[PDB]
Amino acid sequence: KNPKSDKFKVKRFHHIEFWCGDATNVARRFSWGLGMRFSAKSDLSTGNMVHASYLLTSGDLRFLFTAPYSPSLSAGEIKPTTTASIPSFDHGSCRSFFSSHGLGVRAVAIEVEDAESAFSISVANGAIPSSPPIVLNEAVTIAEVKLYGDVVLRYVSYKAEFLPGFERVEDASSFPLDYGIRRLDHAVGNVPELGPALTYVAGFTGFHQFAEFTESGLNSAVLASNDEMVLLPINEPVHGTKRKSQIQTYLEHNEGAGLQHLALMSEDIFRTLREMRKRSSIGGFDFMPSPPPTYYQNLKKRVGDVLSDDQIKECEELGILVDRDDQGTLLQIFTKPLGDRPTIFIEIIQRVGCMMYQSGGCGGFGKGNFSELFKSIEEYEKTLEA
Amino acid sequence: KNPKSDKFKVKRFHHIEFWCGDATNVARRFSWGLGMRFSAKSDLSTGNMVHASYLLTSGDLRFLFTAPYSPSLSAGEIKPTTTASIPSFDHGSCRSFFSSHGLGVRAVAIEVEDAESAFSISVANGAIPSSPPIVLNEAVTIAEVKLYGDVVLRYVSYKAEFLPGFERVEDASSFPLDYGIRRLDHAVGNVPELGPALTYVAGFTGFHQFAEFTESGLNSAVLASNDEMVLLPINEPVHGTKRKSQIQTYLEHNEGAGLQHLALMSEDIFRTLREMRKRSSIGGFDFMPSPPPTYYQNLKKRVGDVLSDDQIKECEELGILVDRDDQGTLLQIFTKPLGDRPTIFIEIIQRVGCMMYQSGGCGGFGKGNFSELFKSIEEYEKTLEA
Ligand SMILES: CC(=O)C1=C(O)C=C2Oc3c(C(C)=O)c(O)c(C)c(O)c3[C@@]2(C)C1=O
Ligand SMILES: CC(=O)C1=C(O)C=C2Oc3c(C(C)=O)c(O)c(C)c(O)c3[C@@]2(C)C1=O
Ligand SMILES: [Co+2]
Numbered sequence: 001k002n003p004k005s006d007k008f009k010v011k012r013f014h015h016i017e018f019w020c021g022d023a024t025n026v027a028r029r030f031s032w033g034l035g036m037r038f039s040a041k042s043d044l045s046t047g048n049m050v051h052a053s054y055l056l057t058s059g060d061l062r063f064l065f066t067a068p069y070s071p072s073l074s075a076g077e078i079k080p081t082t083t084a085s086i087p088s089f090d091h092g093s094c095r096s097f098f099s100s101h102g103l104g105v106r107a108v109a110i111e112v113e114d115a116e117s118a119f120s121i122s123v124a125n126g127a128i129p130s131s132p133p134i135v136l137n138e139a140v141t142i143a144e145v146k147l148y149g150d151v152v153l154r155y156v157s158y159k160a161e162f163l164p165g166f167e168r169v170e171d172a173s174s175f176p177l178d179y180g181i182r183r184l185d186h187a188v189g190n191v192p193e194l195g196p197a198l199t200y201v202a203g204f205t206g207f208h209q210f211a212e213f214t215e216s217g218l219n220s221a222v223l224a225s226n227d228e229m230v231l232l233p234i235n236e237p238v239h240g241t242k243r244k245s246q247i248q249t250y251l252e253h254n255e256g257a258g259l260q261h262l263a264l265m266s267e268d269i270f271r272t273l274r275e276m277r278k279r280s281s282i283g284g285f286d287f288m289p290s291p292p293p294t295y296y297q298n299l300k301k302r303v304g305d306v307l308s309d310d311q312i313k314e315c316e317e318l319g320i321l322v323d324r325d326d327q328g329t330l331l332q333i334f335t336k337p338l339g340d341r342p343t344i345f346i347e348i349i350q351r352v353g354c355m356m357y358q359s360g361g362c363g364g365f366g367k368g369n370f371s372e373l374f375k376s377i378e379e380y381e382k383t384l385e386a
Numbered sequence: 387k388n389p390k391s392d393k394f395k396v397k398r399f400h401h402i403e404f405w406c407g408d409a410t411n412v413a414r415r416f417s418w419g420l421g422m423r424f425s426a427k428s429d430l431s432t433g434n435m436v437h438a439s440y441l442l443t444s445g446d447l448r449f450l451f452t453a454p455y456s457p458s459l460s461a462g463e464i465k466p467t468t469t470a471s472i473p474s475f476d477h478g479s480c481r482s483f484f485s486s487h488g489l490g491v492r493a494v495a496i497e498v499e500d501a502e503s504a505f506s507i508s509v510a511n512g513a514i515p516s517s518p519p520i521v522l523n524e525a526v527t528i529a530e531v532k533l534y535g536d537v538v539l540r541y542v543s544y545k546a547e548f549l550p551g552f553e554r555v556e557d558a559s560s561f562p563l564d565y566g567i568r569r570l571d572h573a574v575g576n577v578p579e580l581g582p583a584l585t586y587v588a589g590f591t592g593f594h595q596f597a598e599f600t601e602s603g604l605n606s607a608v609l610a611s612n613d614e615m616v617l618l619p620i621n622e623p624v625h626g627t628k629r630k631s632q633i634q635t636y637l638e639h640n641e642g643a644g645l646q647h648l649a650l651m652s653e654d655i656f657r658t659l660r661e662m663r664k665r666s667s668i669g670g671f672d673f674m675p676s677p678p679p680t681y682y683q684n685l686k687k688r689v690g691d692v693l694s695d696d697q698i699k700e701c702e703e704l705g706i707l708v709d710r711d712d713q714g715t716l717l718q719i720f721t722k723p724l725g726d727r728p729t730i731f732i733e734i735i736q737r738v739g740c741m742m743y744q745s746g747g748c749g750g751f752g753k754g755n756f757s758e759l760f761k762s763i764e765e766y767e768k769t770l771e772a
């Protein structure tokens with residue numbers, strides 16, 4: 001059931017901002033590995049003496065990569081005179097975030113009708129303020145509240161081209177890469193305590209519970225906006241298992257709560273994964289180990305109604321996982337961690353079904369692949385021995 | 387003249403170590419952009435709880451990329467019990483270096499006959515110690531002294547595979563990229579005062595002056611080992627010119643002295659530059675703007691004895707610069723800065739002549755291209771107007 005209790009008008013995911021040590025190298029790596037175009041910049045060449053910010057896009061997906069310059073460049077500036085294009089930016093907060101967590105997501109940004117009212121309403125309803133509403137060039141309003149750990153939920157609203165102060169990138173340096181990724185489907189946080197985290201976030205957004213889950217080492221629940229196009233799962237560790245909780249491992253290496261994974265919807269997951277896997281060992285992203293043949297043998301029985309034998313064979317070539325709800329079918333695969341620490345990673349997704357446009361969350365988040373993978377693995381060792 | 391006054395036995399450049407925020411993303415970017423293989427690692431997967439270090443190689447060139455993990459992972463360790471594979475590493479020094487300078491070279495490493503004696507002799511002769519000699523696995527000795535700014539000269543010596551504690555990389559993740567780069571030719575520092583810097587470095591190494599230079603905005607001089615295979619140019623700004631000194635701009639954005647550029651010798655600079663330029667806008671490195679056609683028209687007159695018209699045309703397609711000594715010919719080109727700040731960049735080089743093996747420094751460092759580029763530029767505006 002959907003109570004449509006959003007406390008303000010939320011539209012869609014707008015962008016994800018990574019806080020980096022060197023935004024140039026991370027952005028160029030991500031661009032090649034994921035097939036995202038360099039679309040805009042704000043840096044020394046645009047008059048920004050405070051931070052370097054580079055924007056990559058693929059369809060509606062926007063990845064922002066930001067790093068600080070030497071504070072000495074802007075020592076005579078004050079906030080009213082700043083050259084920063086993102087006025088919430090702070091040298092000290094960025095260096096401390098990166099020193100503490102390594103490469104990771106600082107901001108999950110959603111587009112709202114009015115960022116000033118979204119901020120006021122959120123804070124009125126328990127949100128911890130992070131950056132007050134600031135109007136950029138009389139055109140865009142941005143505001144930030146704490147989401148979990150040092151991750152902020154960023155509100156952006158447009159009177160009506162990413163942000164004022166950003167410039168479109170010289171087309172020679174903007175190669176039209178595209179591997180099929182089109183938008184952000186969901187963004188997942190890891191926290192030490194799910195209950196309080198859910199209460200806090202649902203408390204100030206009015207987002208409703210979309211789904212929930214739980215021998216796995218985690219509990220999770222999904223918060224969703226009114227039309228369920230903004231999906232925010234949150235995980236907590238479950239202690240006392242044979243294997244150490246993967247969520248606990250995250251918290252230890254991340255020094256606490258933070259963003260765990262970004263799920264990127266592809267319009268053609270076969271082509272996305274072919275293109276990404278071709279580049280894994282030449283600067284791109286690695287993928288988790290593939291399921292055994294027994295997993296794909298059991299897929300025929302599970303989704304032979306949705307996917308032909310040839311489409312299943314292509315899933316097996318690419319390592320793709322498949323889960324199915326009572327409403328839709330889900331194709332998914334996970335990258336290895338994006339950087340040095342075993343913390344943040346990316347998920348590639350495509351959903352089948354729930355046509356009306358496709359409704360958000362169609363097919364769930366893969367809750368059935370725990371059971372299937374474990375059963376798959378038991379049955380594969382059996383064939384190997386036998 | 388060469389006095390061969392080295393105070394200890396120096397062999398060749400061994401490796402360059404970058405200090406990073408995320409070594410994974412910088413290494414993968416450099417690998418694709420420069421055509422370097424992933425050759426070894428020391429990280430969590432090898433038992434190193436302190437730092438992540440990834441080694442790229444192309445021929446004899448070795449680029450090491452190192453970043454710190456959370457100190458919490460190694461909080462129970464002490465130096466005698468450390469899991470760090472590079473015992474000079476310090477979380478605090480690395481974060482402070484990166485916070486102050488951004489992405490850049492921490493260590494210029496040279497192979498010597500005996501790193502312990504090289505360290506003792508250097509310190510006896512005025513070198514500022516940075517890390518005392520440490521024997522790794524009874525096989526490799528490493529020691530460090532200050533070179534300039536926060537850059538160290540690292541001595542490595544082998545009894546007799548990069549360093550103990552490093553593991554060869556899984557061949558699936560080691561794609562055999564190769565664009566023709568084969569070794570490090572020279573490494574150039576920027577300092578505020580050339581005289582004292584030269585005195586200090588020549589004082590503890592016994593390296594001799596190989597070359598010197600100087601309206602350019604800089605003074606430079608080159609220190610060289612006995613056989614002149616280790617070449618260490620150093621630049622200082624010259625203040626009071628129409629344009630601000632490029633060296634001064636470096637010092638301001640780098641927060642002081644540091645490594646300015648690495649010159650990488652190619653065995654086929656045409657193929658290296660074709661391969662690198664193909665990748666500039668898809669995750670690789672950008673190049674400085676090419677000289678005008680007038681520069682290449684005047685090359686026929688200057689090196690038509692060394693390069694055919696077709697070889698000159700290929701230089702013009704690729705933006706390659708050409709200088710010539712009384713002893714050899716030099717082909718060279720410069721990248722844009724490697725990261726966010728207008729600080730460190732790379733030079734690709736190939737030398738022609740001085741055969742005996744080829745003697746180091748063959749053809750100089752491009753001192754004639756100041757005059758030629760300026761004259762080239764004046765003559766090109768002339769054709770445009772006319
Ligand atoms: C929110 C999200 O994005 C998620 C994700 O992408 C991958 C899924 O795998 C699991 C698993 C297992 C056995 O792997 C589990 O035990 C629980 C309790 C769980 O909740 C999930 C999933 C469905 C999930 O939540
Ligand atoms: C040491 C090194 O590697 C160097 C480099 O790679 C590029 C060269 O260009 C110049 C220039 C000009 C006009 O560009 C100059 O005025 C001076 C005094 C100079 O000393 C050099 C060079 C030769 C140099 O030193
Ligand atoms: Co997911």
Ligand SMILES: [Co+2]
Nearest residue numbers: 574649733751
């Ligand atoms: Co040079």
